[PDB]
Amino acid sequence: LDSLTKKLSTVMYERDAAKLVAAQLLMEKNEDSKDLPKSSQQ
């Protein structure tokens, strides 16, 4: 019971931790688009 709860806890923590990687990554990827688009335009 408790030995599985350790796996549950470590996962959920690391999941939402890994989830924040995406939030960061997505906004930087987005920044690269408008930058290049507005530059390639002119």
């Binding site: 350790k6 806890s9 470590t10 923590y13 690391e14 931790a17």
Partner: protein, 48 residues
């Protein structure tokens, strides 16, 4: 939560080197473009 923060420490501490090392190499390439673009400008004075 102790075992959480214990684990969070060990997986995070390794991820940082990888984060930095990527940006480090990302920076190295950026420096090259900077390092060459000057030279073309420098060669404007040679023609004059």
């Amino acid at each position: 939560m102790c075992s959480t923060l214990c684990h969070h420490s060990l997986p995070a501490l390794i991820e940082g080197q990888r984060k930095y090392y990527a940006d480090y190499y990302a920076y190295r390439q950026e420096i090259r473009s900077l390092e060459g673009r000057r030279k073309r400008l420098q060669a404007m004075l040679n023609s004059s």
